[PDB]
C-alpha cells in the first residue's frame, strides 16, 4: 500500500491501434565545446577544368 514499482510495461501487439503501436525514435543533439568540430558533412566536390 502506497509502495509501488516505478516502472510498467508496454502493451505492444501486432493488432494494437496506431497510437498504441511501437515507434522507434532517434533524437540528434549537436554539441559545440571548446574543442575541434570532428563531425562534418560531405561538402561534395565538382569536376576540374
Amino acid at each position: 500500500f502506497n509502495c509501488y514499482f516505478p516502472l510498467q510495461s508496454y502493451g505492444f501487439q501486432p493488432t494494437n491501434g496506431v497510437g498504441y503501436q511501437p515507434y522507434r525514435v532517434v533524437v540528434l543533439s549537436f554539441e559545440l565545446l571548446h574543442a575541434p568540430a570532428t563531425v562534418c558533412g560531405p561538402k561534395k566536390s565538382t569536376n576540374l577544368v
Partner: nanobody
Amino acid sequence: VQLVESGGGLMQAGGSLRLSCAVSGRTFSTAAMGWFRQAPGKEREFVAAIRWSGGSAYYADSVKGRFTISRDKAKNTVYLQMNSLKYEDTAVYYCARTEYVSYLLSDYATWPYDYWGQGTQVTVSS
C-alpha cells in the same frame, strides 16, 4: 525457455518442504516468478509471487505465515519454502514466469503468466 521444478513429494502434516524452479534457455528479462497449485478436481489457484527486481513478495491468504517465496537471480531459480504443511496443501504445484512489469505487486496474483513448469506433486499425510 523452460521452467524445471524439483523438490516436494510426500511429507507428514506439520513438516516443511522446499520447491525449486530453475529457468533455463535465453531470457531477455524476468519481471516476476510465481507459484500456483491445483488440487484434484479443483481450479488452479495462486500461491505466491516475487518480483525479480527487489524481491518483494505477494501471498495468497491461505499460505500467509506458513510459506515463503524467495529468489536467487544468479541461479535464475525461484523457491517455495512450505512450512507447517496441512492436508489442504496437497496439490500439483506449478512454477510460472512473466516478463510483464506491473507497478502494482498484487497484479501478480491475477496476471496470466507466459511460461509454466510441468508441475510437482506435494502430498501431505497424517
